[PDB]
Design an enzyme around this catalytic site. Sequence first.
Site, PDB file in Angstrom:
ATOM      1  N   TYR A   1      56.303 -21.489 108.380  1.00 24.33           N
ATOM      2  CA  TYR A   1      55.246 -20.990 109.256  1.00 24.33           C
ATOM      3  C   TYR A   1      53.866 -21.415 108.764  1.00 24.33           C
ATOM      4  O   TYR A   1      53.009 -21.823 109.548  1.00 24.33           O
ATOM      5  CB  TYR A   1      55.343 -19.479 109.363  1.00 24.33           C
ATOM      6  CG  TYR A   1      54.456 -18.859 110.419  1.00 24.33           C
ATOM      7  CD1 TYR A   1      54.758 -18.980 111.771  1.00 24.33           C
ATOM      8  CD2 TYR A   1      53.331 -18.112 110.055  1.00 24.33           C
ATOM      9  CE1 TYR A   1      53.964 -18.395 112.738  1.00 24.33           C
ATOM     10  CE2 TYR A   1      52.522 -17.524 111.015  1.00 24.33           C
ATOM     11  CZ  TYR A   1      52.845 -17.663 112.355  1.00 24.33           C
ATOM     12  OH  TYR A   1      52.033 -17.082 113.306  1.00 24.33           O
TER      13      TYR A   1
ATOM     14  N   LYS B   1      51.283 -23.828 110.765  1.00 17.27           N
ATOM     15  CA  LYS B   1      49.938 -23.358 111.112  1.00 17.27           C
ATOM     16  C   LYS B   1      48.832 -24.124 110.396  1.00 17.27           C
ATOM     17  O   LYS B   1      47.774 -24.370 110.972  1.00 17.27           O
ATOM     18  CB  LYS B   1      49.799 -21.840 110.879  1.00 17.27           C
ATOM     19  CG  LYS B   1      50.689 -20.960 111.779  1.00 17.27           C
ATOM     20  CD  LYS B   1      50.744 -21.430 113.238  1.00 17.27           C
ATOM     21  CE  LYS B   1      51.024 -20.278 114.203  1.00 17.27           C
ATOM     22  NZ  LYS B   1      51.080 -20.708 115.650  1.00 17.27           N
TER      23      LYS B   1
END
Lengths: 246, 246, 246, 246
Positions: C154, C158
């Site tokens: 993640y 991001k």
Amino acid sequence: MLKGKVALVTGASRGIGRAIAIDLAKQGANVVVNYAGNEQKANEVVDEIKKLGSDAIAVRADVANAEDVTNMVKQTVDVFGQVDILVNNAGVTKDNLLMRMKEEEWDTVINTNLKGVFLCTKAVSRFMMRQRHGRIVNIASVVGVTGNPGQANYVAAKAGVIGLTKTSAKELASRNITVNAIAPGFIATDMTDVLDENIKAEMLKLIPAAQFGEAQDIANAVTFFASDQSKYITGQTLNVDGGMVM
Amino acid sequence: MLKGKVALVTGASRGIGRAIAIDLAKQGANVVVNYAGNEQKANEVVDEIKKLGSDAIAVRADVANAEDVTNMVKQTVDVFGQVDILVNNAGVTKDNLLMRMKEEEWDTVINTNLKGVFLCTKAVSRFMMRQRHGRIVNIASVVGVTGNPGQANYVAAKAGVIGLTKTSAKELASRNITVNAIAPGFIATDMTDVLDENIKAEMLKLIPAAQFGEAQDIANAVTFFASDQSKYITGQTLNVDGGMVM
Amino acid sequence: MLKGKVALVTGASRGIGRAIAIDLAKQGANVVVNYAGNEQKANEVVDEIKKLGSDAIAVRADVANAEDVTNMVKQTVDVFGQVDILVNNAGVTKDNLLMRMKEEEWDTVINTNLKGVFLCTKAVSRFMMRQRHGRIVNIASVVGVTGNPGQANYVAAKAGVIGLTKTSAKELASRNITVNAIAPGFIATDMTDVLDENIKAEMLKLIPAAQFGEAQDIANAVTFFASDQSKYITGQTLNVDGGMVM
Amino acid sequence: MLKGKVALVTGASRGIGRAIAIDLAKQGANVVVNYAGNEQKANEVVDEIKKLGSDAIAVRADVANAEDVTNMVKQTVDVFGQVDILVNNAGVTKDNLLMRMKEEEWDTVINTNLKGVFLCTKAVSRFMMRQRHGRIVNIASVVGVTGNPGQANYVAAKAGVIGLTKTSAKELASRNITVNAIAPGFIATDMTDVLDENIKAEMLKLIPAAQFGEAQDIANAVTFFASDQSKYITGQTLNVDGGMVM
């Protein structure tokens, strides 16, 4: 391995500044050990440098005082023939909540920590630009990157130093001078001050390494930047903090 | 001085990766020279490492391929007994303006540059966590920090690597494993495609050092991170770029 | 004020994405409410937008699927005449410690969160470039800046999005298209995920605001970027996080 | 939508500061227009604010002078009943190459740009903490993030402001006060004295938007931060710079 180099280290009489002075000497540098107040500790650092085969002198100067700075740099060049490395480590703290913080607490921290870097950088420049080489390393603080509740003055100063490092890097690049910053986190010899075993324990939760650093960790980093091999690194800030600020 | 250490360097057959492999070996490490394609260049690097007194093997693996990676790490541990250092240098570029960029150009760059770091970090983790020490250094790019018009895929991949470095640093810290990134700027070996002298000269204007770097500049930084002395540095990215990105 | 604008919001069926869709409509935009499998909920968001005087349609698309994305953009332009605003909010989490994280957990998160942004940005660009105006806002995460132990995939995705934002900003800038990112911190509807008060309370200590955010906080920031007045802001990431990452 | 708010804007008599003052008033704030020098321009701003239905006064204060600042804040609260918003925009430049820069050129810039923020923040905090709400927005500069050759003093000051912003955010959070910074790029009203076509053209090449900004671009951003809706944003710096610093 700094053979034939001469280093001027401000605030070199103990802790981080002392470890830096000693490590530079270990790599072959002659060292100017600057101090503001206590001659006795500075003389010990000098004695230790001479023990390990290098040369050193202790010089008293307030880095916030233009005339002191000018004479210090001049002495360096007079005694050792040149100046090759400047490490700006001088600096005080005067903590307080913003609402509690005196104007003189603000001034003394800004002048010592930030204006000192300006004044010392300015004073060595002429010698480094002429010889067409040099290393400046500025000791900032991770708190300058993230902010910190007790320390508006200190945070402002150290954030300022990190910016000043970049302007200097840019201005001095054309004369083969690099300028970089080390931002220490929580290092043991800085925290002889903070003995409350709860303020301490919390600080420690913030560090992935789960332990405070040592003065030698900062010296390791400084020496790397001071060396010929790191020639292509300029204007950078390296956090030495156990992972506290990434 | 990496004595008794074993290093796995991905994409080690030339340029930066090669310089890294050779410098690590110089400091005493046994080196696994990973390559994707033609094995001749990798074999040359292995020959050079043996010349300078160390030991090495060449291992073919696509770093985007899970089984290749698993086998590679296993071979490292089988031949040399352990793995102490991982440097993730494998990576391709497939430049194009965003609106022309093919989906496969995107996938290949992401998988090689980003997924490779994941896969290799995952594979060595078990070994390093068990022995309770390690060094991982990821080769990113300064373009990951700033963005760059031709390189949506590459910028995304390298920005991702910088973030992945921080998660890894945080997860692995409890076991004395540090994880850091080096972000190269414009280095001569990685600029072979660039023989258009107008792109070069305008790139050069962007660098305060006013010159392109050399592969050895990256090696010196990697070696510093790989060393025991840099133990208190984790989750950090160091730009080696002549001041281009400050 | 967004009068006459049309907005495509990916992952718009609930939480942050929903709040964004609704707020854009509130400012006068017609909205395309994208969803992956939750049609029930996308229809509700559509109903709410129509209640407040605007128009909307719900469109199913897997943002990792090139054919779906192309279909979706085309439907937007077919039904509403044009596309003026893209907000990339689609994204999943599949948390795990690096050493355990499955390759498919990695792939699914990278493809949804990062490749989706690429694919959607690519698909809208030509329309926006032709009309010579547009707004793209990418919803990233503060975790992409700092790293975070459970979330290698993640964080990488991001961090990648934040880099992609900058390349896009640079490529599209001269067709008067701005591209910016919002990096949410810990937002309440976004943590339907967490109910365990152990991890939950540890997160709260990290936030100077001393409270979790709300979906509307993100919407407020997206709407600011989506507006004509923020025309001179491009390539930026704004943290909306109660002061967690400064 | 600032109805019933009172704003104190330092350096509000022209350019950015003036646009800020006028925009705040436009949203319903009563405004204190601070100036240092001749009171005329400040009176014009006051006249304009009254024309658009709001109320204002012009107040003389050296923001580097503790007593001036204390009296200014006190006048604000005396005339308008309270202080809800502080924007720190006061600041001078005194450019010079480092090794030509005078000590008084350094001092004046640091005191005005950095110490002024400290002094004003300190002075208003008193009242904002008590009422348990406030907005402080500090006007920094993008140059504080990157460095800039002519401007060691200005860069140090503005870098310092960005750090001070974070300390303030952290200290004032528990009393529902947010503190943020706007970092302008090259804005038309800041550049009167950059007459040379050559130096202008080069600056412009650095901006992806390919144009200088306008004072209203900064006012736009300030107003967003000053508003109730941006309550979950604190300790942040937003670059308004046409993409110059990403």
